[PDB]
C-alpha cells in the first residue's frame, strides 16, 4: 500500500505551500525538514516503514523516465518565445560556455578535495551533479518585484540548456561507468553524439510542424485539439527514447518551444488549460521528490557524518559562486563586443542568479540508486542534499537584500505617478456615484460608514549643469508622455502586439541611456532585410520532382513579405507619435532653446524617416494595401464587438445571444488572423476608374485616349487657386486631399470624384482652394475633352445626369443641415434616400412646372425662377418650400435654369 | 503491446468527430461502423489480433471499477442543481416508478419470447442492460436549438437516477448469480439495501462538506485546490468501493452534486478547468469502449446470428417504446395533481425522449465476460448492440422531425425582432465607423470591396375576436416590454442571479397560459416561509453538550433570512417594474378601454403589493437594511470596475497595472461573498444621532428629552404647506423627503438633518412644500423648543453656527452654479472647501467690518447692507463682490445682519 504515503505527501505540499508565503524562502524546505522529520520515526516505530518501504526503493528507471521528462518540459513550456529568439543565440553560446568551463573545474576540486581513489568519472558525476540550474523561485520574486522582463526571460531561458546538456553527459558518463561490458570507442562515440544531435531537434521539428498543420483544420471544436496533443506529445517522448535513451528530453523540448511559438491557430481557452494542467503535473511531481529524498537522506546519510565533510560543503559553495562569477565577468567583454552587453548591475545579479533545484536532486538519487551498496552515493547525496538547501536559503535572503541596497527593482518616479493618478480618478468616480446613490428613494435606510470603510481603493506602493537636469526632466516628461500616446494609439486596435513590444523595446533602451533619444538606425535595420536571407533569396531565384520547388518559394516570399509589414505599420506608429510631439510639447515646457531644439530634432527626424517609408511603398504596394486592408478590419471589427457589448450593457437583449455573437466575431478574428499574408497585387488604376463610376458609355473607355496623364503632386501642393479661369479638369486616381471652400466649409475627397464641375458649367472661375496632403496620382482633362464628352453623351447626358445630381447632393447637404426644415438627418440618410432622383426638361413643359402631390423634393441647382402667383423672383441655390405649386422660368443662355425633382 | 490501438482509437475518434458533426447523427455509431471493419482482419490476418489480443480481453473487474465510475460522474457533473432541486421530488420519484416498471415487465416478454431455460435472474439481468439511458446527444441538439432549459435539465436529471438504480439492482443480481454460495437470506439483503441506501449519500455529504469547509479558508491561490479536490473525490471513491462495492458510485454521485452546487467559494478558473478536465476523461472513455464493443461484437456474435432473432430485435424496440410510453402517459395525470404538469407536446416528446449509450454497452461487457464460454453472453450482446444501433440512429432523426412538425423549438417573434434590431444597429454603427475611416489621411490606397466583403454580420436564423386578438399583441408587447426593463434592471448590478432566475421563470409560466397575466399569489409563496422548515423552527424555538445545540441555530435562522432577502428582492424588482409600467405602456397603444383595463389591473397589483413589501420591512428591518447595503456595495464596485475599464481604454494607463486593479475588485468580490447573510441589528437610531451630527454637548443630550415625538408619516403626505404660520419644526430620524421651492427647485433631504430653518430665523411663513414618498418616522420640535435652544445657545451658539453655516451653503450652492464667477465647481467641492468658514460678530467691530486678503468668500445671509464709498444699499441673498472692502450695516432688532466670512 502507498495510497496513505502519497495522499500525505500532497496534503503536507498544499499545506506548506499555502501557510508558508509571507516569508521570501521557498516553501520546499519546509518539505525538506518534514521529511527529515520522518527520519526519527524512520528509525524507531516500525509501522512508518511498513507503510513507507515499498515507496521509500523506486527502480531508478521510473524516474530517470517519468520525473525528468515532465520537469525539463515543464521548465520549458512557459516560456516567451519571442523575447527568448531575441537574443538566442547569445544566451546559447554563453549558457555551453559556462556549462563547459563548470564541469571541467570540478575535477581539480574532486582531487585536491578528496584524495580517495575517484577516478576522471566520478569527477564528471559529480560535476554533472552539482551543475543543475532551477530559475522558478527567483523569476517568481523578480515578477513579485517587477524589475525587468528581458532580464527574467533570459533567466528562465539559459537553465533549460544548462539541465539540458547537464542531462547528457550525465547519462553518457553512466553509461561509461556502471557498464563498462559496453563499447566506448571514439568512432561509436562520436556517431552518438553526432546522431542525436542532428536528429532528434529536427525530428521533433518535423513532428511539431505536421501536428500543427493538422491543428490548423480544426474550427470551434474543444475535445479533438487537446486530444491529439497530448497524444502527439507522447508518441514524440516514445519514439525519441526508444530511439535513444537519452534523445527524449531534447525532443520534447523542441517540441514544447515550437507549439508554445504558435498561438494564432489555437484557441486561447486551449492553452490556457493546457498550461495550468502541466504545471498541476509539475508542481505533484517537485513536491513528492522533495519529500523523498528529506524521508531518505536521514536514515541513509546517518553514518557517513564528519566534520571535515562539514568543511567540504562550505568551501563548494564559496568554489561554485566565485567559477561563475569569474566566468561571468570574462565573457562580460564578449557580450559587450558583439553588441548586446549588459551592466554591470547584471552582471551581479548574474552573480547571485545560480540557483539548484529538482533535477539535481533527482540525478543524485538516480546515481545512488545504479551505486547501490555502497558508501560513495550516500557521500553523493549527503553533499548534493547540503550543498542545495544552503545555496538556496541563502541566495533567496541575498538577492533580495542586493536589490534592496542596489534599488534596480524600485520603480520609476512617472509609473508611480500614473498610478497615483488613477487611485484617485477611481476615488471621485466612487466619490459621485455615492452621491448620485444618496438622492435615490429606495436606499435610505443603509448605513456608509461600513459601506465606505470596504471599498476604499489605495496604490499598493504606498549653470549649465542646472540646464543639463531641467533638459533631463523634459526628455523624460517627452518619453512618458510618448509611451502613454502609444498604448492608447494601439489600444483602438490600430497596431499590432509584436509591433508593440519591438516599439517600447527600442523606446525604453533609448530612454536608457543617458542624455539619448529614440534614433531610427535601430529602426532601419528593424526594417531592413539582412543576414543570410537574401543570400539564400538569391540564391533561390537564380537557380529557378518540380513540384515541391516552387509553392514552399512562395511561402519563403511570404516570410519577408511578413517582416516588411512589421516594419511598416512601425513607422507608421512613430509618425503619429511624432503627430503627437507636434500637439503636445508645447504646453509643459518652459524655456525657449531647449523647445525650439526639441522641436528641431523632431523635424530631422520626421523628414528622415517619410522618405524611406515612401520609397518602400513606391516599390511594394501591395504589402501597403494589404496591410492597410488588415488595419481597416480590425478597426471596424473591434468598434463592433465594442458596440454589441454596449447593447448588452444599455440592457437591448440578454446576453444569451451575446454569447453568440461573440463566438462569431471570433471566428471572423481568427479567419482575419490567417490572413492571406501572401502579397494581394493592387488593382490596375483603369480598372478602379471603371469600378468606381457608372462608365457605361464606350466613348468613356474612348476618354481614356483623351484624359490620360498620370501626374503627381507630392505634399502640400496646392493643385488650383480660387479665382483661376477655369480651363482644365481632373480625376484623381491615386490619394486623398483636402478642399477649403466658401459660411466656409471644409471636405475630404478621395479617388473616385471629379472635379471642376461648376467650372464647366457655369463657365465660373475657381472658388475654393485644394491641397493634397501626400503624393497624389490624378489625370488631367481638358475643356476640349469636356466637349468631346458633351458631344458623346448625344441623345442621353449619363454623365452631365450624374453629375448634377452629384452637384445637387454636394448644395443640399449643408443647407439641410442647417436649415430647421431637416434637423436629425445624417450623413448617409442624406447620401442615400436622395439618390433615387431625376430631372424635368422644361422644353417640353415650356418652362412652366406643375408642382403636385407626387413630388416631394424639389431643389432649384441653377438659374432664376419666379412664383406664378405671388411673382417672387427666387434664385439658386435657396431651397423652395412646397407653398410654390407653379413656377415660370426664363430662357436665358447665359443661365440655363437647373432643377431637381424627387418622386414619391 | 497496446500503444498503436488506444492511440488509432484516439485518432479515429478525432477525425470522425471532425468529419461526421454536420449531420444531426450522433458520430458513435461511424465507431461502431469501425469496430465491425477491424472484424473482418479480425478474422484473416494475424497482424491485427497479436496487436489487439492484450486490449480485446481486459479483466472485467477494471472496468467495472474504472470506466462505470468516471462515466456516471460526468453524467452528474455538468448538472445546473438549482433548476434541479426546484422539482428533485417529482423527477426522482417517476425516475423511479419508470424503472421499477421497466425492470418487471421484461421477464414477461423474456418468457413468452425466448421459451428457454432462462430464469427470473436471466430476466433481471436483461432488464438491467435495457433499461439505461444517455441524454447527452438528446441535451446536445436541444441546446442547439434552444427550445427550453427546465426540459434539457429534467432529460439530464432522470437519467442519473435511472443509471444509479439500473447499476444497484445489476450488481446485486449478478452477485446472486454468478456466485451462488453467498447468502441470499432476507435479513442479510435488507441490510445490505438499507446500508446502501441511507448509509451511502450521508458519507459523501459528510466528505463534500468537510473539503468545501477547507476551500473555504484560502484566498488567492490557483494550484491547491485542484490538487485537493481530485484527491478528495479519489479518496471518496475508493473509500466507497472498499466499504461496499456498489455504493461507491453513489457516493461520487452524491459528492458531484454537492460539490457543483457551490460556486461562490471556487474561483470561476478553476470550475472551468475541471469541468474541461473531466468532460475530457469522460468523451475518451466512451470513444475507447465503443471502439472495443464494435470490435468485439464481429468476431463473437458471427456464429449465433439467426433471422428469428432479428425479429427478435425488431419486436424489443416495440415493446419498449410502447411500454416507456404508456407508463409516462399514465403518470401524466399525477404530476397534473401534484401541480407540475406538463403540456401534451412534453408527453410526446418525453415518449421520444429515451436514448441508450455508453453504460448499457459497459454491462454488456462485464456480464458477458462474468458469463466466459457459453452462448447467452453472446446472445446478450447481440441483442444489446443491435437495439442499441437501430435505437440512437432513429430516434435522432424522429426527434428532429418531431420538433420540426410541432415546431415547439421555433424562435419567437419578440426575439428575432430583437435581434434583427441589433443587427441594424450593428449595421449602422459599422457603417459610420467606415465613414469616419473613410476621410482619415493616412489609409487612403486601401480598397473597401474585400473590406466590406470582410465584415458582414447577419442573424444565424434568416368583432370581440378581434378584440382578444388585439389585446393578446398588447400583453405580449407588455411581456417583453417588461422583461426587457429587468434585464436592464440587473445589468447594473442592481439584482442577484438567483432572484432573476425565479423572476423571469414566474415572468415565462405567467405569459404561458393565453390571456393570463403575471400573478402575486405565486410571488407570495415565494416570499412565504412554507413547507416542514417552520414546523422545525417552532421545535427548536420550543426546546431552547450544550455548546453544539446554538450556534448551528443560528445559522439556521440565517438560512430563513437567506430566503427571505431573495423573496425581498424580487418584491423589490416588481416595483422597478411597475415603475416601467407607469412610463411604458403609454405610447404603443391604440385604444382606449384595454389601455384604461391594463392600467387598472396594474395598480390593483401596485396597491396589492405594497403592503406585504411595508410588514415584511415593519417586523424584520435589519434585513432590509442587510440587503439595501449589499446593493450599494454591487452597484458602486460595478460602476468602479467600469469606470477602471474606461481609464484603461482611455490610454493612460497600460495593463499590467490592471491585473493588480482587478485583483483587488475581485477580492473585494469575494468580500461581499464573505459577508455575513446573518442579520445585522438596525442602529439605534436615538444612539446614533451623536455619530450622525456631533452631541458631544450635554445641552444636546437634553434636547434629546425635550422632543421624542417619533411620529410616522404615510406615503404621499404633505408636512406642511407654504405659507403656514412658523409654529414647529422636525428633525427627521427615518426616511427621505422631496422639497419643492422657489426659478423653482427640487431637493431630496434624507436623515441627519434639520428643517424649517427659516422659520425661526427670519420669522417668516412657509415658503417651500416638503412631501414624503414613503412612511417615515420624524421628531416634533417646537417653537417655544425653539426658545429653549436660544436658552442653550448662550454665550457660545454653536448649533445656531452649524445651521447658519448649512442654510449659508443651502443659498450659496444654486447661486455659485448659477452666477458667472464660478463655473466648473461640482456639488462635492461646493460642499467640502467652503466648510472650513466661520462668523465674524459686529457687535464687537461697531456693524463696522474691514475686508482684508484675509478673506476669500463674503456671503450676505440675512440683512441689509450699505457701501462705505459707494453707498450701495444691497440686501440678501445677494453675493458680495471682491471690488467692495468696507461695508456699514444698522442694527435693526427686525432683520439683524449676517454674513459668512472664510479665512484663507
Ligand atoms: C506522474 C506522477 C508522479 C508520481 C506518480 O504518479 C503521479 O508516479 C506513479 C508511478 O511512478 C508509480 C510507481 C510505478 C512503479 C510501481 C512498481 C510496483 O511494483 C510492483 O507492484 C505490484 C503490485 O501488485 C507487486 O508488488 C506488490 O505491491 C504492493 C503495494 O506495495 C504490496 O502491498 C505487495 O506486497 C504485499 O503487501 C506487503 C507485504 O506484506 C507482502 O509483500 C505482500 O503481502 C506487493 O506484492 C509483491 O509480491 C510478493 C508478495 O505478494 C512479494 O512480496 C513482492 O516483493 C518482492 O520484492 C520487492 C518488494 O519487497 C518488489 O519490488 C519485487 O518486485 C518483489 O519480487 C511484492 O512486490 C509487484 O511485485 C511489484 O514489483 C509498485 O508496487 C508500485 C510502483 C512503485 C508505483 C507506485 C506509485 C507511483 C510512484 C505513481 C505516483 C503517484
Ligand atoms: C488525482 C491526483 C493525482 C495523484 C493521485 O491523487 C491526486 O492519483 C490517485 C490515484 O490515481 C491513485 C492510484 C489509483 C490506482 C491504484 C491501484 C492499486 O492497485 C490495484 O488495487 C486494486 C484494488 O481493488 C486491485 O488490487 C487488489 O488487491 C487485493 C488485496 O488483497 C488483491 O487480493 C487482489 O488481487 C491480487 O493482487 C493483484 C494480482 O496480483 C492478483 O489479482 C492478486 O494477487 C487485487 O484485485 C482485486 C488491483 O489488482 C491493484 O493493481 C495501487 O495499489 C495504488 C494505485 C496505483 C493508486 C495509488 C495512489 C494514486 C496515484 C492517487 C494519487 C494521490
Ligand atoms: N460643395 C462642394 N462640395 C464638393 N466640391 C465642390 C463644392 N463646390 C464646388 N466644388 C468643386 O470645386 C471646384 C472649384 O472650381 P470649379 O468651379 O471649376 O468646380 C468646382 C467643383 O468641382
Ligand atoms: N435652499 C434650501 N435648501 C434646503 N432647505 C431649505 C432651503 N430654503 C429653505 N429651506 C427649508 O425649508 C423651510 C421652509 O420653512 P421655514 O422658513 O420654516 O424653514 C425652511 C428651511 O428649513
Redesign the interface.
Given at each position: 500500500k502507498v495510497?496513505v504515503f502519497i495522499?500525505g505527501s500532497?496534503?503536507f505540499?498544499?499545506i506548506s505551500?499555502?501557510l508558508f508565503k509571507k516569508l521570501p524562502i521557498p516553501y520546499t524546505v519546509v518539505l525538506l525538514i518534514l521529511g527529515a522529520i520522518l527520519g526519527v520515526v524512520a528509525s524507531n516505530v516500525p509501522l512508518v516503514e511498513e507503510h513507507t518501504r515499498d515507496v521509500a526503493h523506486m527502480d531508478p528507471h521510473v524516474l530517470l523516465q517519468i520525473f525528468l521528462p515532465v520537469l525539463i518540459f515543464e521548465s520549458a513550456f512557459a516560456m516567451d518565445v519571442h523575447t527568448f529568439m531575441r537574443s538566442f543565440s547569445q544566451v546559447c553560446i554563453l549558457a555551453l560556455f559556462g556549462l563547459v568551463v563548470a564541469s571541467v573545474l570540478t575535477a581539480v576540486l574532486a582531487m585536491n578535495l578528496f584524495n580517495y581513489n575517484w577516478n576522471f568519472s566520478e569527477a564528471m558525476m559529480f560535476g554533472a551533479i552539482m551543475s543543475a540550474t532551477d530559475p522558478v523561485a527567483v523569476v517568481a520574486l523578480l515578477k513579485d518585484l517587477?524589475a525587468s522582463k528581458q532580464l527574467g526571460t533570459i533567466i528562465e531561458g539559459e537553465s533549460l540548456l544548462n539541465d539540458g546538456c547537464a542531462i547528457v553527459i550525465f547519462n553518457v558518463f553512466m553509461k561509461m561507468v556502471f557498464f563498462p561490458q559496453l563499447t566506448s570507442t571514439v568512432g561509436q562515440n562520436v556517431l552518438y553524439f553526432l546522431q542525436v544531435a542532428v536528429a532528434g531537434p529536427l525530428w521533433g521539428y518535423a513532428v511539431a510542424k505536421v501536428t500543427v498543420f493538422f491543428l490548423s483544420?480544426?474550427f470551434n471544436?474543444?475535445?479533438?485539439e487537446?486530444?491529439?496533443t497530448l497524444?502527439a506529445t507522447y508518441?514524440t517522448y516514445?519514439i525519441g527514447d526508444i530511439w535513444l535513451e537519452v534523445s527524449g528530453v531534447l525532443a520534447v523540448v523542441v517540441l514544447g518551444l515550437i507549439v508554445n511559438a504558435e498561438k494564432t491557430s489555437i484557441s486561447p481557452?486551449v492553452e490556457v488549460?493546457l498550461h495550468?494542467?502541466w504545471?498541476?503535473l509539475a508542481?505533484?511531481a517537485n513536491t513528492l521528490i522533495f519529500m523523498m529524498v528529506g524521508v531518505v537522506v536521514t536514515q541513509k546519510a546517518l553514518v557517513a557524518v564528519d566534520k571535515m565533510d562539514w568543511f567540504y560543503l562550505i568551501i563548494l559553495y564559496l568554489a561554485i559562486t566565485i567559477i561563475r562569477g569569474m566566468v561571468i565577468s570574462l565573457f562580460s567583454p564578449i557580450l559587450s563586443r558583439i553588441g548586446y552587453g549588459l551592466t554591470w548591475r547584471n552582471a551581479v545579479i548574474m552573480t547571485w542568479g545560480g540557483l539548484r533545484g529538482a533535477v539535481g536532486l533527482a540525478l543524485a538519487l538516480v546515481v545512488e540508486n545504479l551505486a547501490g551498496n555502497d558508501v560513495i552515493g550516500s557521500k553523493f547525496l549527503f553533499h548534493t542534499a547540503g550543498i542545495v538547501v544552503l545555496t538556496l536559503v541563502i541566495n533567496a535572503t541575498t538577492i533580495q537584500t542586493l536589490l534592496r541596497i542596489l534599488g534596480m527593482s524600485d520603480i520609476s518616479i512617472p509609473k508611480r505617478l500614473?498610478?497615483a493618478?488613477?487611485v484617485r480618478?477611481?476615488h471621485?468616480?466612487?466619490?459621485?456615484?455615492?452621491?448620485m446613490?444618496?438622492?435615490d428613494?429606495?436606499?435610505?435606510?443603509?448605513?456608509?460608514?461600513?459601506?465606505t470603510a470596504?471599498?476604499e481603493?489605495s496604490d499598493?506602493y504606498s549653470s549649465p549643469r542646472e540646464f543639463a537636469d531641467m533638459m533631463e526632466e523634459a526628455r523624460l516628461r517627452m518619453l512618458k508622455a510618448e509611451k502613454?500616446?502609444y498604448?492608447?494609439?494601439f489600444?483602438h486596435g490600430m497596431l499590432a502586439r509584436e509591433a508593440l513590444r519591438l516599439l517600447v523595446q527600442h523606446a525604453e533602451v533609448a530612454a536608457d541611456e543617458k542624455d539619448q533619444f529614440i534614433l531610427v538606425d535601430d529602426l532601419k535595420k528593424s526594417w531592413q532585410i539582412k543576414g543570410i536571407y537574401p543570400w539564400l533569396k538569391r540564391k533561390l531565384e537564380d537557380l529557378i520532382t518540380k513540384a515541391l520547388i516552387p509553392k514552399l518559394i512562395l511561402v519563403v516570399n511570404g516570410k519577408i513579405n511578413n517582416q516588411l509589414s512589421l516594419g511598416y505599420d512601425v513607422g507608421?506608429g512613430y509618425?503619429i507619435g511624432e503627430e503627437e510631439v507636434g500637439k503636445i510639447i508645447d504646453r509643459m515646457v518652459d524655456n525657449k532653446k531647449i523647445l525650439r531644439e526639441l522641436k528641431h530634432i523632431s523635424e530631422t527626424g520626421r523628414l528622415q524617416v517619410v522618405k524611406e517609408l515612401g520609397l518602400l511603398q513606391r516599390e511594394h504596394?501591395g504589402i501597403?494595401?494589404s496591410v492597410?486592408?488588415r488595419?481597416?478590419?480590425r478597426?471596424?471589427?473591434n468598434?463592433?464587438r465594442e458596440?454589441?457589448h454596449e447593447?448588452?450593457?444599455?440592457?437591448?437583449?440578454?446576453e444569451?445571444?451575446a454569447h453568440?455573437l461573440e463566438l462569431?466575431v471570433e471566428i471572423?478574428m481568427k479567419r482575419?488572423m490567417n490572413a492571406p499574408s501572401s502579397i494581394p497585387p493592387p488593382?490596375p488604376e483603369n480598372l478602379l476608374k471603371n469600378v468606381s463610376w457608372l462608365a457605361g458609355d464606350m466613348k468613356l473607355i474612348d476618354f481614356i485616349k483623351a484624359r490620360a496623364s498620370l501626374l503627381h503632386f507630392d505634399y502640400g501642393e496646392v493643385i488650383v487657386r480660387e479665382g483661376d479661369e477655369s480651363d482644365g479638369l481632373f480625376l484623381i486616381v491615386?490619394?486623398?486631399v483636402?478642399l477649403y471652400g466658401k459660411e466656409v466649409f471644409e471636405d475630404?475627397l478621395?479617388?473616385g470624384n471629379v472635379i471642376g464641375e461648376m467650372g464647366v458649367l457655369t463657365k465660373k472661375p475657381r472658388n475654393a482652394t485644394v491641397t493634397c496632403?501626400?503624393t497624389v496620382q490624378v489625370y488631367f482633362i481638358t475643356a476640349e475633352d469636356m466637349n468631346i464628352a458633351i458631344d458623346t453623351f448625344t441623345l442621353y447626358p449619363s454623365l452631365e445626369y450624374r453629375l448634377w445630381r452629384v452637384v445637387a447632393i454636394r448644395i443640399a447637404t449643408p443647407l439641410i443641415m442647417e436649415q430647421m426644415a431637416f434637423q436629425g438627418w445624417?450623413?448617409?440618410k442624406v447620401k442615400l434616400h436622395l439618390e433615387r432622383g431625376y430631372l424635368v426638361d422644361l422644353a417640353e413643359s415650356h418652362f412652366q412646372f406643375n408642382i403636385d402631390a407626387t413630388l416631394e423634393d424639389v431643389i432649384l441647382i441653377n438659374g432664376t425662377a419666379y412664383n406664378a402667383h405671388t411673382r417672387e423672383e427666387i434664385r439658386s441655390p435657396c431651397l423652395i418650400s412646397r407653398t410654390v405649386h407653379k413656377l415660370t422660368f426664363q430662357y436665358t443662355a447665359t443661365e440655363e435654369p437647373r432643377l431637381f425633382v424627387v418622386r414619391n
Open positions: 495510497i495522499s500532497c496534503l505540499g498544499a505551500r499555502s517587477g483544420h480544426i471544436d474543444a475535445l479533438v487537446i486530444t491529439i497524444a508518441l516514445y481557452e488549460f495550468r494542467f504545471e498541476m508542481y505533484l500614473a498610478m493618478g488613477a480618478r477611481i471621485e468616480g466612487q466619490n459621485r456615484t455615492l452621491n446613490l444618496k438622492s428613494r429606495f436606499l435610505a435606510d443603509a448605513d456608509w460608514d461600513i459601506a470596504a471599498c481603493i499598493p502613454i500616446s498604448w492608447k494609439q489600444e507608421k509618425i504596394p501597403a494595401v492597410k486592408t488595419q481597416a478590419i478597426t471596424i471589427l468598434h463592433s458596440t454589441i447593447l448588452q450593457g444599455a440592457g437591448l437583449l440578454d444569451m445571444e453568440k462569431t471572423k482575419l488593382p491615386s490619394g486623398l483636402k475630404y478621395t479617388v496632403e501626400t445624417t450623413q448617409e
